[PDB]
Structures are given as structure tokens and as C-alpha cells.
């Protein structure tokens, strides 16, 4: 179980996409890259909107997560808008190596220089609770059903099933693979069909 920290614009999309990936165990959205303590959504400072991905390394590689990272946005433009900058926060020198190598390869393969910045991770601060699993949290029916099942907002948003559900609500996940992850969760059958009834209503 390893950790990656990316930033590729507003983090709702990154959350809903990376949380649909098999091998991603959990996701959090937050702020990282600035020089201020506990930034808030309307008080980011120099921070960037970021996603922290906890992934099973036996299923997906850091390099494959980087493939997906550069597959979700094309940072061939240089902005000074720090809230939406494209950054890779590396937790060790292996992540730094892989990211620099892949960035060089993209720059050479497409002829466009890449403005994603590879920087060391200092502090990743959590975003407000209303930003976590944003799409799922706004389908109040299924949201509160799953929250009652998992017994709390914190237990919910920190789970793999919540990431997959937030992705499926955003249209980034097949319903079949949602069923597969629900099988992985091993719900006590009654909650299982309740959840499936709610998800197929959409």
C-alpha cells in the first residue's frame, strides 16, 4: 500500500477518475504546495488543489498512475494560477525519478514541453468535508444510505467502495465493475440489494 500525491486542476474530476481505478484503495482531496498551515478552499494561499491516492502496488504501478495523470490533462501551457497548477508531489526519490523520466519522454514524444512540476511533498492538508466524494455526496439518497451502512462520513469517504461509487455517479465506472467492487466489500446481502436498487435507479 503506497501513496501518491498529484495536482491537475480542480480536484473533483481527479477524485472521481482515480477513485474508479482498480488498485486504488482510497482517495482524499486537499491542498498542497503552499507555505501556509491548514489552508481552506477560500484561503488556499500558494497551495494547489491536490489529490492523495492510496493504491495497492500489487495491482497498479506508480508509473501507471502517472500515465493516467498525464492522460487526464495536457499541461502544455504555463500559468501562474497556483490553485490549478499541474504538479507531482513525490514522497521518495523513486517517484521523483519515474516522474522526471516520464515527463522527459512525453516532452520528446509530442514535441511540446510539459509544464508539470515535480516537487517534494511537504504537507498535504485535507479539504473540507463537502469536497470529499463530491458527486456521491450530492446524490443524497444513495449517499446517506451508504453512509448509514459504513457508519459515519469519515468511514465512508475513506473506503474503496465510496471512491468507486463516486466515480460511477460521475460516469467514470462501468456498472459491472461497480458490482465487482461491491462483491469485494461483501455486504450482508440486504444492504447489497438496497444499494443496487438505488444505483440502478440512475
Amino acid at each position: 500500500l503506497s501513496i501518491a500525491v498529484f495536482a491537475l486542476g480542480c480536484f473533483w474530476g481527479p477524485d472521481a477518475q482515480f477513485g474508479s481505478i482498480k488498485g486504488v484503495v482510497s482517495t482524499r482531496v486537499g491542498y498542497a504546495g503552499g507555505t501556509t498551515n491548514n489552508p481552506s478552499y477560500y484561503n488556499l494561499g500558494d497551495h494547489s488543489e491536490s489529490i492523495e491516492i492510496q493504491y495497492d502496488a500489487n495491482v497498479i504501478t506508480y508509473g501507471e498512475l502517472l500515465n493516467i495523470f498525464w492522460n487526464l490533462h495536457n499541461p502544455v501551457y504555463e500559468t501562474t494560477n497556483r490553485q490549478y497548477m499541474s504538479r507531482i508531489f513525490y514522497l521518495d526519490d523513486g517517484q521523483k525519478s519515474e516522474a522526471l523520466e516520464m515527463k522527459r519522454q512525453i516532452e520528446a514524444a509530442n514535441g511540446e514541453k510539459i509544464y508539470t512540476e515535480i516537487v517534494p511533498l511537504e504537507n498535504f492538508y485535507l479539504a473540507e468535508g463537502y469536497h470529499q466524494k463530491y458527486y456521491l455526496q450530492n446524490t443524497t439518497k444513495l449517499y446517506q444510505t451508504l453512509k448509514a451502512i459504513y457508519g459515519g462520513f469519515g468511514n465512508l469517504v475513506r473506503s474503496t467502495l465510496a471512491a468507486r461509487m463516486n466515480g460511477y455517479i460521475a460516469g467514470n465506472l462501468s456498472i459491472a465493475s461497480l458490482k465487482e467492487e461491491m462483491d469485494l466489500v461483501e455486504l450482508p446481502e440486504d444492504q447489497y440489494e438496497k444499494v443496487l436498487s438505488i444505483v440502478e435507479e440512475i
Binding site: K22, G23, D56, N58, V59, I60, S174, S177, E180, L184
Partner: protein
């Protein structure tokens, strides 16, 4: 002892690998699109002996009784 022969196709290899790892089953992965030896070893298994049933458009691999029943 478990071996998973994988491909560079993201739907199902990751499905099998997530299932195995979540159940704490340790396995070694051989990617048959990047390891020619792995694909030659998989061909030494009766893998071309498995039949495939095409129903107008969809593909069932192996005798998956219930699946074929539903189409």
C-alpha cells in the same frame, strides 16, 4: 503458488489482480504482451483448446453455462 498471465488491457487483468490481492493471496504476474517467454509458456498450456462462442456480437470465452443461457 499463484501465477497471473496479464496483458496491456486494463479492464480485466486489474480485476483479477485486485481480487487476488484483496484476499491477501500473493501472486507473481507475467505480462504476456511484454514477456514473450510468458506467452510461450501460456501457449504450452491448452489455451487455444478453450472454445469461444460468438452470439451475434458478444463473446463468451469458455463454456460459461449461465452466461450463454442469458443470451
Amino acid at each position: 503458488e499463484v501465477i497471473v498471465y496479464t496483458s496491456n488491457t486494463c479492464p480485466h487483468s486489474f480485476t483479477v489482480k485486485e481480487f487476488l490481492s484483496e484476499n491477501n493471496v500473493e501472486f507473481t504476474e507475467k505480462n504476456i504482451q511484454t514477456d514473450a517467454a510468458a506467452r510461450k509458456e501460456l501457449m504450452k498450456k491448452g489455451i487455444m483448446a478453450v472454445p469461444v462462442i460468438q452470439i451475434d456480437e458478444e463473446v463468451v470465452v469458455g463454456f460459461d453455462r449461465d452466461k450463454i443461457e442469458e443470451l
